[PDB]
Design an enzyme around this catalytic site. Sequence first.
Site, PDB file in Angstrom:
ATOM      1  N   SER A 191       0.802  -1.283   0.070  1.00 51.47           N
ATOM      2  CA  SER A 191      -0.058   0.092  -0.042  1.00 51.47           C
ATOM      3  C   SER A 191       1.048   1.181  -0.061  1.00 51.47           C
ATOM      4  O   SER A 191       1.779   1.463  -1.014  1.00 51.47           O
ATOM      5  CB  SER A 191      -0.945  -0.198   1.268  1.00 51.47           C
ATOM      6  OG  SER A 191      -2.024   0.699   0.778  1.00 51.47           O
ATOM      7  N   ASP A 197     -10.117  -6.045  -3.295  1.00 59.37           N
ATOM      8  CA  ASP A 197      -9.226  -4.673  -2.636  1.00 59.37           C
ATOM      9  C   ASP A 197     -10.201  -3.641  -2.850  1.00 59.37           C
ATOM     10  O   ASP A 197     -10.585  -3.380  -3.917  1.00 59.37           O
ATOM     11  CB  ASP A 197      -8.160  -4.335  -3.194  1.00 59.37           C
ATOM     12  CG  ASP A 197      -7.010  -3.583  -2.448  1.00 59.37           C
ATOM     13  OD1 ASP A 197      -7.697  -2.439  -1.919  1.00 59.37           O
ATOM     14  OD2 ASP A 197      -5.919  -3.620  -2.376  1.00 59.37           O
ATOM     15  N   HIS A 235      -7.407  -6.047   0.558  1.00 54.41           N
ATOM     16  CA  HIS A 235      -6.100  -5.165   0.638  1.00 54.41           C
ATOM     17  C   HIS A 235      -4.981  -5.652   1.394  1.00 54.41           C
ATOM     18  O   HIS A 235      -4.118  -5.021   1.154  1.00 54.41           O
ATOM     19  CB  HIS A 235      -6.639  -3.746   1.107  1.00 54.41           C
ATOM     20  CG  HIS A 235      -5.727  -2.770   1.039  1.00 54.41           C
ATOM     21  ND1 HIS A 235      -5.311  -2.303  -0.073  1.00 54.41           N
ATOM     22  CD2 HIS A 235      -5.016  -2.294   1.931  1.00 54.41           C
ATOM     23  CE1 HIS A 235      -4.413  -1.263   0.097  1.00 54.41           C
ATOM     24  NE2 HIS A 235      -4.330  -1.169   1.415  1.00 54.41           N
TER      25      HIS A 235
HETATM   26 CL    CL Z   1      -1.871   2.666   2.859  1.00 53.71          CL
END
Ligand code: CL
Length: 254
Positions: free
Chosen positions: A80, A205, A233
């Site tokens: 991420s 996600d 995610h």
């Molecule tokens: Cl993040």
Amino acid sequence: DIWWQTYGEGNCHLVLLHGWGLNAEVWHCIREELGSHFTLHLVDLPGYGRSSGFGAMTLEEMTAQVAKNAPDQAIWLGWSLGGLVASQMALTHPERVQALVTVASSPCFSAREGWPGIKPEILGGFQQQLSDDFQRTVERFLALQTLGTETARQDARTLKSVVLAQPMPDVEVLNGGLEILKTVDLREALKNVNMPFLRLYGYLDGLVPRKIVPLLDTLWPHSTSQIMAKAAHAPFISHPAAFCQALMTLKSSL
Ligand SMILES: [Cl-]
């Protein structure tokens, strides 16, 4: 100083970078499996976790600090927000990066013309909300990351436990991190990285839309991708076995 940890004794070095609002403890679940195959270098991003004494930083500023005490040579894997840091490291110190791996990450988190993502007003809302509803807001952003999976409840608890196990970073730090997500667009820059570049995604996600995968397969012809069908995610938490297998295959291919 930035908090770094070494774990494992494998013959290939692997840097692991966590996402916003978290810290290196998110990797606890895969350490044992990976440690015979890689020597892991776990870092708390500056301002996050145990890396106190930093404030708001741009991606450029943040990556330069992370680079200081990182290993000389390693695969760089970022989750991420951590994926943006890994990407920027590949763009700045390519000779130090044996391969670039992103997991559940986008080169441009914000939706733009012809480009799927998070509406920038949503990220701006989280930023504004940090001022008066600090704790719940952090938790509300993290709660988006585990939805729709077989293990959603357990996995949300896992991330919340990571947050609660350490003191909260300064609002300045958290707001700055959302600003990186909201404003950075590495789509054009990453066309030019030449080391192996593997992009892992979760089908479910809700932050990084799976629609970006074929767009980027085409925009970044030298890269490759893998979509985990039942992951959201946090694919290394929900599907650690498939996640580790992707890294084995990469290691063998170097
Ligand atoms: Cl993040």
